[PDB]
Amino acid sequence: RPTFYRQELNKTIWEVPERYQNLSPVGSGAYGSVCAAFDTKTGHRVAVKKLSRPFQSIIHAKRTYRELRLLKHMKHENVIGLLDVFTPARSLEEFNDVYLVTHLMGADLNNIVKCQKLTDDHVQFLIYQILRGLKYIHSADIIHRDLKPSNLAVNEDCELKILDFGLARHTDDEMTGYVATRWYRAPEIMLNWMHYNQTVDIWSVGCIMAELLTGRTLFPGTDHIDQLKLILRLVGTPGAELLKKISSESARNYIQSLAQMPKMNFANVFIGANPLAVDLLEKMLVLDSDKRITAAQALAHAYFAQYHDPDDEPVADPYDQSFESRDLLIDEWKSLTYDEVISFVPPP
Ligand SMILES: NCc1ccccc1Oc1ccccc1
Ligand SMILES: [Cl-]
Ligand SMILES: [Cl-]
Ligand SMILES: [Cl-]
Ligand SMILES: [Cl-]
Ligand SMILES: [Cl-]
Ligand SMILES: [Mg+2]
């Protein structure tokens, strides 16, 4: 057991192992409080997150377990990993506080591309890395659900990691009106058409790749309905085959009220883009999610010829998510979380 020290940071008590020095607040949210620190054990600059009210309800205690299980599992170059997890408690009886440690991230994709377009070579490398990370995530039957530029960290060498997985239901208010939180969402999840699956992430990659090529948001809708009209104008109104797969009767009736439109010519929309970039966008931005290209298929597309290496695109160890259908008490989720904290093995 390391020695812990206490200090108060912006009306918040922090009790952390001595290895973590020079803590300074970086962010605050509903989820918790975040400090930058220097890790004397590894020489890395790190983010330390103190979870807020981790065991306040069953909903909160289950979210805390979900987040720790997910971060402990993810071991890939293009995905955020867990450097450390600690509690000051010396027993389950006094356990209340959970702290998560990850590599400090300097810039997100917005910081390299806010109101700006990039070279084709930069777009190839950046989208290759997202898909390498998604092949790994999807091989464990994990759906990210919230891919957008602010959830992608990038360094001065254009190296990229995926972070901030979807682990809480987003609030109704958070998805309302002119907001980046909805611009990257697949239509089937934005409007609750049907049970969604991992193909929602590929729709988000199509929206990010379009915005790197043009320097403009692809579908910046002022609300859910405006955003759907922008989508259907590019990819066309749905045929009978997709209309059948929409479980909601009222969602089906609403779509049928719209005048029919054909799919546009993507070479006339993405003027001057590499023809291989236009071809891959037509394969991602498909309205019927059954027909979209998968991350494993996209890695073999000619657009990535200079980066693709089928001996260095690894898959994940199996991930058990059976806990998600388990009905447990607060103290039972808390005990499961405690065991996961004490069994943590640091990376080499
Ligand atoms: N949002 C402006 C934009 C800029 C560049 C390329 C596409 C684009 O969005 C479109 C274009 C055509 C139909 C639907 C969306
Ligand atoms: Cl220490
Ligand atoms: Cl990492
Ligand atoms: Cl504690
Ligand atoms: Cl964003
Ligand atoms: Cl597992
Ligand atoms: Mg985020």
Structure tokens at 239: 């045929």
Check if 230 has its Cβ closer than 6 Å to any atom of ligand 1: yes
Asked whether the beta carbons of 182 and 227 are under 8 A apart, the reply is: yes
Using CA positions, which residue lies closest to atom 10 of ligand 1? 218
> Radius of gyration of the chain from Cα atoms?
22
Check if 233 has its Cβ closer than 6 Å to any atom of ligand 1: yes
Expt. technique:
X-ray
Check if 142 has its Cβ closer than 6 Å to any atom of ligand 1: no
* Candidate of 217, 219, 269 to mutate for ligand 1, largest count of ligand atoms within 8 Å of Cβ: 269
Structure tokens at 207: 């929206």
Secondary structure in 3-state letters for the chain: CCCEEEEECCCCEEEEECCEEEEEEEEECCCEEEEEEEECCCCCEEEEEEECCCCCCHHHHHHHHHHHHHHHHCCCCCECCCCEEECCCCCCCCCCCCEEEEECCCEECCCCCCCCCCCHHHHHHHHHHHHHHHHHHHHCCCCCCCCCHHHEEECCCCCEEECCCCCCCCCCHHHCCCCHHHHCCCHHHHCCCCCCCCHHHHHHHHHHHHHHHHCCCCCCCCCHHHHHHHHHHHHCCCCHHHHHHCCCHHHHHHHHCCCCCCCCCHHHHCCCCCHHHHHHHHHHCCCCHHHCCCHHHHHCCHHHCCCCCCCCCCCCCCCCCHHHHCCCCHHHHHHHHHHHHHCCCCCC
Residues annotated in a binding site for ATP: 26-34, 49
Q: What's the CA-to-centroid distance between 269 and ligand 1, angstroms? A: 7
Structure tokens at 228: 């759907």
Check if 273 has its Cβ closer than 6 Å to any atom of ligand 1: no
Of 120, 164, 226, 288, catalytic: 164
Structure tokens at 109: 């994709």
Ligand 1 atom closest to Cα of residue 219? 1
Of the candidates 284, 282, 302, which has an alpha carbon nearest to the alpha carbon of residue 294? 284
Q: What's the CA-to-centroid distance between 10 and ligand 2, angstroms? A: 23
